[PDB]
Design a protein around this ligand. Structure first.
Ligand SMILES: Cc1cc2nc3c(=O)[nH]c(=O)nc-3n(C[C@H](O)[C@H](O)[C@H](O)COP(=O)(O)O)c2cc1C
Ligand code: SF4
Ligand code: SF4
Ligand code: SF4
Ligand code: SF4
Ligand code: SF4
Ligand code: FES
Ligand code: FES
Ligand SMILES: [Zn+2]
Lengths: 243, 95, 79, 216, 101, 72, 111, 433, 63
């Protein structure tokens, strides 16, 4: 008796057989090749993520969804980990807690410090994930790294100072959008995301890019600084422009 | 860590006919009872020569607009002689 | 005794025949006991920190908020 | 260095291609992979472009190779900017790279670096004008059991004559001699500068495999 | 009397959390605002301008429906979309194209 | 022209934008700077490390000071 | 008062933090991207009455934009005044910019 | 058993290349003898033989190569199979594979063929390093001569086994040394690693089953498979056996690279084959047994430690690539460690955040500690950061960036504390004026 | 210098709420096994007046 997150109608392509895994104790049923992250979801516990979107491909890139699966070595990336019958998942063990604390420590270490001007402040994943799962004190004094901002037409302006190298935008632009312009170039700490020939992005779904990109770097230009999120009310309607 | 004595004695000697829920937390000890015996229960207290409360501190209402029994009446009352306080919390609907 | 009050012994006067005069004398004796406490504090006040050790229930001070990074996140979320 | 082209005076998007022998070599290079996956050939092809433009690698060349392997140019940009052996800053006719890492530092490389830099007016990834001599620094290039080394890349005749050779067992006087011999003369015999030792081992009598091999 | 709409607010399109989904909530579709001529603040005259989504948060569509029916004002329940759960695979990410045609 | 027209009314003394354009660039020496003024607290403007690899000045996003790299 | 940098450049950056923490909701603030690029406030007003004087303003501000100067003699004869205008009169708080400054220095240590 | 390896048991009889070219048209003495029989003796026999020998993978992991080859799909399939040789040695201090490739290439080629058969592999790619233009020229000449002689191709030697081998230029980076990042950079994309749950035995190079083996093991494979696995197991120790070539360089009189048997006392190796240290156990301060990715070994420890996969692995370190470095008493050990950490900063490509950020941070802290501009709680913070990075990265370059500083603040705390104290005293003395 | 937020934040590290139901069987069992004693019923919190002076404490000074 444990409803999945948000309600999530699992498929059961072959409903005659389906594995079962122990998530934090009590068991849950799972289709053949479902990932550990979706198994935890079905069990009803959310796992912090940055570089995993249910509509794009997987990439163990942000390294924040770590859990410990007993019957295994120390760390495990939840996503991209295909569930096995009987593995002993565990999410709230000191190992996982410290893993999350350290990773958030590194992100917020080499992040910029401009929340009170950076819109998506009040909506930011990185912000909420840090406040809920990360530590409370930073230990860092030396100079950070900063890059120059970029223009991508009059729809998606970017202050790339805060491009935390998730490749969500890259994977979207190469899988769902269709046009391959965005790309991650550079090395090490000096790694930017930007078209190399200062071109624009002549495709639709770029608003979908600005929704995908969690931290507030790619943001809608015509909604530059007009409001935070906590200020305005949302009504759920349909569209009439398209068909 | 405050008044386990009075609460334990009161529960172990009460007529167990009219107690619907007991919670011995550390925030406050709760005797959730039925609205039909409330006067009976309170008159048991204030008179029994061990758990005599003798002072009623508060009668507050709480509103839960999602349950069939919409309201929640709560009586916070202490025992100045036995240095203890208990919270008798009853349910109550519209009329 | 919710707070430090133990280490702060005092008197707690009590009236013998409840009426206006005895409540009045109680009030004056309570003034004097409060003076006893107000002196006992500045003789024991243990110079140290204040208000917290977690910048998740208490906001960080100005220097940290404007120098460190996670201090700004916590100040923002907390306000 | 940088991660965004700035389109200088005469290098925005001028037309750029290969020669004819370079076309033949391009076919030969492209003939080593499954035709479905030709993206791999991006690593050798890129290099060829260098040897055709003097270690330059202009943006039109990246576009040309991206067109020759049928890929959106951003992937070729990624490849050409992630690695380290590709330069995009028109180094001089001769590039001089000095190694730095602990097993090669503690043999006295910093001296070679400082002396080579002082003999010219350059500043460590800078171009001595009359635009011969570019100098720069690199991480461990292997062979760090031999000596403090100095590698020289020669872009003189283009695809032919381009030569990327080491120079081991060096001392600042030998280095200044070598660089001026490169200017005036043409080619100094590379190697290890009078190896009283045997390459990649001891000095004099090698203490292994003394007389003759033998099939087991 | 007033027509009300009982829905469950969908997940925000900016974050990736889940602590705010599956929470039945009634809104009074009240929109009668105007611009205060002196300063420019947004005036109103509806007593139910904000209560429906400021304090009235219900546990389930059944409870919210019974409550609206009790106070009498007529309602019209909406639907709740839930994410379908497919199966993913890093191998499917690194699939293999066929032989040359 | 439009923002200062929306908020300011006097249009006799110069608007904030006009003053912050009247201040010239800084012409710093290295490649990265940090803008606060001259104190760490009591002057706000948290650390805002900003790159300087473009032939045009770089604004600071608080109290735009337009730092510029000096040499090549 | 709304201070500004020594360069004459305004301090406020429209975080909405003061408006969010206002326990009396006595602040209204509405911003827009300026022409030069930086973000500033198009309208900022505090209807002083509804603004009980609690202090949270000068604590929520990450750039010390808004502050409470030590002036208590403003006893106008018409409500509209105490509805301090759209940042304009608030900007004129800079007529105390010296005095206020002093206070801030003496509170940089323990605050 | 002990150290000291006779001349006849040695394998790489070319490591110096004077009377012995690459093409082996003059020196076919060693290789290509009867590979026809060794491939028509079936693949399962080859895997059994390797498992019986004990060839712990000489790349930096130590996996039992028998299992690693047995992991490939036994029953046939559709999509073909690929072997890939990881000739991308660029860990600072290793100069063995360079000599193997430059002087004795046909060893690597025949080993590639025999391992491709032993893995039911269809093709095989050797990923050379970038700045090896002359070595690459020699290797490519050798491969062309092997194709010309008909010894590597459709009918490999006399077997019906089809096999194509291909060289690939290197890039210039170092993360390409890793398994999955090697497969990636061979595809054509940037040199970044993959996630392990799709192990490169069912989803590898092109998605085909493809395994990556270091040039060491695949180059030693022919002679170990020919001379019988007992002659191989008769070396080293019980669980660690074989002949490995060390590349000793740093602060010795004679910097060298020579092949010995495992479990050889460092004293014996250094004092016997290489030149004795400038002062034999007198001014020798530190020793790094493995590559630059292995915690230190102070003087007191390394006097009597064996050199294998377990002895120093039990002490604290790991043999890794077996590139022993020595450092005298007149070389700032903290400066050497800082330089290594700077290298690791300059090589971590930066897919996932822990390695990238933490490595920049480690370099900064190590510089500040080199000058002496820190406190003691800062060295404890260094240990903490080390632990976090080591735990939670994608693959072993995080451990690489974490291990040396860990070993440093493990075996060298007193001198570091002394540096800090002296800087503090000098700062106070200067501030008093 | 050793930030570690769970061990510091023993908050949210509280045990779960434990519930139990009782029926007539358990009620009867507890009623039978239970037995009072002459002592430890509850304790009593007794306190009385003393009629103390004013100038006593610390010569009537310290506090
Ligand atoms: C940071 C890093 C550096 C590596 N460097 C090398 C290298 O120089 N040579 C190599 O063959 N493999 C290298 N690898 C890959 C591993 O050593 C891998 O286990 C090996 O290629 C296969 O092991 P085996 O062939 O010994 O069984 C590296 C891996 C990492 C994570
Ligand atoms: S996206 Fe902006 S608001 Fe969010 S933490 Fe990152 S910098 Fe702050
Ligand atoms: S700024 Fe956006 S695209 Fe860049 S790493 Fe961050 S979330 Fe990804
Ligand atoms: S907190 Fe400060 S700058 Fe930010 S919006 Fe308010 S007064 Fe304006
Ligand atoms: S002083 Fe307080 S009441 Fe006035 S607006 Fe500022 S935060 Fe609110
Ligand atoms: S250091 Fe680690 S996470 Fe980073 S590129 Fe290397 S294997 Fe990937
Ligand atoms: S979500 Fe699993 S690693 Fe980023
Ligand atoms: S350190 Fe210079 S060659 Fe390896
Ligand atoms: Zn500024």
């Amino acid at each position: 008796p444990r409803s999945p997150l948000a309600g999530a109608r699992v498929h059961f392509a072959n409903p005659d057989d389906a594995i079962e895994v122990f998530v934090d104790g009590y068991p849950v049923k799972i289709p053949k090749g479902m990932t550990v992250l979706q198994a935890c979801e079905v069990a009803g516990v959310d796992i912090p993520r940055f570089c995993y979107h249910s509509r794009l491909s997987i990439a163990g890139n942000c390294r924040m969804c770590l859990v410990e699966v007993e019957k295994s070595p120390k760390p495990v990336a939840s996503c991209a980990m295909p569930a096995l019958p009987g593995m002993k998942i565990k999410t709230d063990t000191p190992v996982a807690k410290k893993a999350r604390e350290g990773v958030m420590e590194f992100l917020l270490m080499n992040h910029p410090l401009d929340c009170p001007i950076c819109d998506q402040g009040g909506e930011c994943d990185l912000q909420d994930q840090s406040m809920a799962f990360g530590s409370d004190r930073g230990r860092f004094t030396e100079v950070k790294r900063s890059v120059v901002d970029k223009n991508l037409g009059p729809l998606v302006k970017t202050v790339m100072t805060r491009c935390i190298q998730c490749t969500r935008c890259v994977r979207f632009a190469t899988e769902v959008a269709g046009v391959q312009d965005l790309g991650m170039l550079g090395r090490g700490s000096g790694e930017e995301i930007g078209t190399y020939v200062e071109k624009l992005l002549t495709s639709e779904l770029s608003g979908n890019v600005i929704d995908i990109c969690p931290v507030g770097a790619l943001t809608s230009k015509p909604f530059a600084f007009k409001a935070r999120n906590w200020e305005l009310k949302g009504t759920e309607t349909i569209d009439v422009t398209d068909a | 860590m405050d008044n386990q004595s009075i609460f334990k004695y009161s529960w172990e000697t009460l007529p167990k006919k009219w107690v619907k829920k007991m919670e011995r937390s550390e925030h406050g000890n709760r005797f959730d009872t039925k609205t039909d015996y409330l006067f009976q229960l309170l008159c048991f207290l204030k008179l029994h020569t061990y758990t005599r409360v003798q002072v009623l501190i508060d009668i507050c209402g709480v509103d839960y607009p999602s349950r069939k029994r919409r309201f929640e009446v709560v009586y916070n009352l202490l025992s100045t002689r036995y240095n203890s306080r208990i919270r008798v919390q009853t349910s109550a609907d519209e009329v | 005794p919710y707070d430090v009050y133990d280490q702060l012994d005092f008197d707690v006067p009590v009236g013998t025949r409840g009426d206006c005069y005895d409540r009045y004398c109680i009030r004056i004796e309570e003034m004097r006991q409060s003076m006893r406490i107000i002196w006992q504090c500045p003789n024991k006040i243990p110079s140290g920190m204040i208000k917290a050790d977690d910048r998740k229930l208490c906001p960080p001070s100005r220097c940290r908020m404007k120098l460190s990074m996670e201090s700004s996140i916590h100040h923002f979320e907390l306000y | 260095l940088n991660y965004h082209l700035d389109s200088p005076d005469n290098n925005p998007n001028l037309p750029w291609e290969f020669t004819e022998p370079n076309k033949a070599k391009v076919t030969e290079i492209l003939s080593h992979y499954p035709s479905n996956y030709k993206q791999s050939a991006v690593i050798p092809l890129l290099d060829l472009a260098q040897q055709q433009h003097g270690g330059w690698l202009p943006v039109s060349a990246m576009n040309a190779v991206a067109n020759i392997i049928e890929v959106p140019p951003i992937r070729v940009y990624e490849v050409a900017t992630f690695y380290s052996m590709f330069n995009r800053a028109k180094v001089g006719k001769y590039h001089l790279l000095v190694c730095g890492t602990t097993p090669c530092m503690i043999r006295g490389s910093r001296g070679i670096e400082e002396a080579l830099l002082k003999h010219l007016g350059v500043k460590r990834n800078e171009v001595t004008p009359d635009g011969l001599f570019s100098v720069g620094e690199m991480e461990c290039m292997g062979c760090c059991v031999n000596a403090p080394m100095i590698t020289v890349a020669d872009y003189s005749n283009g695809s032919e004559g381009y030569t990327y050779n080491y120079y081991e067992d060096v001392t600042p006087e030998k280095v200044v001699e070598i660089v001026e011999k490169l200017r005036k003369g043409e080619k100094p015999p590379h190697g290890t500068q009078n190896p009283l030792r045997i390459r990649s081992g001891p000095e004099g009598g090698n203490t292994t495999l003394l007389g003759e091999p033998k099939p087991p | 009397r007033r027509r009300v709409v009982i829905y469950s607010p969908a997940r925000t399109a900016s974050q990736q959390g889940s602590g705010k989904v599956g929470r039945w909530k009634i809104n009074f579709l009240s929109t009668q605002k105007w611009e205060n001529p002196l300063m420019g603040w947004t005036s109103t005259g509806d007593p139910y301008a904000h209560v429906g989504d400021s304090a009235l948060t219900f546990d389930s569509a059944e409870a919210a429906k019974a409550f609206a029916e009790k106070h009498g004002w007529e309602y019209s329940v909406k639907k709740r979309h839930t994410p379908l759960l497919k199966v993913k695979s890093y191998a499917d990410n690194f699939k293999w194209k066929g032989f040359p045609k | 022209s439009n923002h200062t027209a929306k908020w300011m009314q006097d249009t006799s003394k110069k608007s904030p934008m006009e003053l912050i354009n009247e201040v010239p660039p800084i012409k710093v020496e290295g490649r990265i700077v940090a803008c606060e003024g001259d104190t760490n607290p009591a002057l706000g403007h948290p650390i805002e490390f900003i790159c300087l690899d473009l032939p045009e000045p770089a604004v600071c996003k608080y109290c735009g000071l337009r730092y510029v790299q000096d040499h090549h | 008062a709304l201070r500004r940098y020594p360069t004459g450049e305004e301090r406020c950056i429209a975080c909405k933090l003061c408006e969010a923490i206002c326990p009396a909701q006595a602040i209204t603030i509405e911003a827009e991207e300026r022409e030069d690029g930086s973000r500033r406030t198009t309208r900022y007003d505090i209807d002083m009455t509804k603004c009980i004087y609690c202090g949270f303003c000068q604590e929520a501000c990450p750039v010390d934009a808004i502050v409470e100067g030590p002036n208590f003699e403003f006893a106008t004869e018409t409500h509209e005044e105490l509805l301090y205008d759209k940042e304009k009169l608030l900007e004129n708080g800079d007529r105390w910019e010296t005095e206020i400054a002093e206070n801030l220095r003496s509170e940089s240590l323990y605050r | 058993h002990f150290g000291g390896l006779k001349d006849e048991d040695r394998i790489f009889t070319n490591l110096y290349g004077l009377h012995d070219p690459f093409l082996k048209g003059a020196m076919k003495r060693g290789d290509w003898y009867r590979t026809k029989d060794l491939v028509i003796k079936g693949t399962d026999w080859i895997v059994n033989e390797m498992k019986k020998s004990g060839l712990r993978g000489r790349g930096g992991a130590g996996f039992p190569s028998g299992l690693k080859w047995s992991f490939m799909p036994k029953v046939s399939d559709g999509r073909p199979s690929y072997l890939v040789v990881n000739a991308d040695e660029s860990e600072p201090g290793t100069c063995k594979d360079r000599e193997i490739m430059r002087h004795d290439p046909h060893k690597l080629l025949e080993g590639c063929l025999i391992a491709g058969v032993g893995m039911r592999a269809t093709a095989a790619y050797i990923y050379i390093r970038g700045e090896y233009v002359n070595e690459r020229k020699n290797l490519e000449k050798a491969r062309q001569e092997a194709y010309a002689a008909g010894l590597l191709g459709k009918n490999a030697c006399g077997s019906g086994y089809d096999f194509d081998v291909h060289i690939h230029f290197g890039a210039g980076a170092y993360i390409c040394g890793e398994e999955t990042a090697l497969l990636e950079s061979l595809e054509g994309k940037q040199g970044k690693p993959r996630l392990k749950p799709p192990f490169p035995a069912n989803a590898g190079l092109y998605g085909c089953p493809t395994t990556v083996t270091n040039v060491e093991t695949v180059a030693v494979s022919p002679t170990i498979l020919r001379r019988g696995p007992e002659w191989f197991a008769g070396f080293g120790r019980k669980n660690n056996a074989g002949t490995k070539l060390f590349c000793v360089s740093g602060h010795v009189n004679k910097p060298c690279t020579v092949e010995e048997e495992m479990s050889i006392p460092l004293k014996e190796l250094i004092e016997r084959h290489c030149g004795g240290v400038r002062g034999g156990w007198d001014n020798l301060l530190a020793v790094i047994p493995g590559g630059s990715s292995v915690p230190l070994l102070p003087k007191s420890i390394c006097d009597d430690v064996l050199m294998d996969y377990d002895a120093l692995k039990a002490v604290q370190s790991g043999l890794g690539t077996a590139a022993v470095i020595v450092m005298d008493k007149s070389t700032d050990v903290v400066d050497a460690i800082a330089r290594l950490s700077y290298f690791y900063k300059h090589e971590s490509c930066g897919q996932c955040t822990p390695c990238r950020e933490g490595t920049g941070w480690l370099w900064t802290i190590m510089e500040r500690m080199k000058v002496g501009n820190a406190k003691l709680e800062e060295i404890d913070m260094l240990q903490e950061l080390t632990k976090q990075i080591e735990g939670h990265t994608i693959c072993a370059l995080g451990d690489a960036a974490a291990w040396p500083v860990q070993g440093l603040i493990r075996h060298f705390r007193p001198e570091l504390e002394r540096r800090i104290r002296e800087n503090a005293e000098r700062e106070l003395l200067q501030a008093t004026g | 210098y050793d930030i570690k937020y769970f061990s510091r934040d023993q908050r949210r590290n509280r045990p779960p709420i434990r519930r139990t139901v009782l029926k007539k069987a358990d009620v009867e069992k507890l009623a039978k096994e239970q037995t009072f004693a002459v002592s430890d019923f509850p304790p009593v919190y007794l306190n009385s007046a003393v009629e103390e002076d004013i100038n006593a404490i610390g010569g009537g000074y310290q506090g």
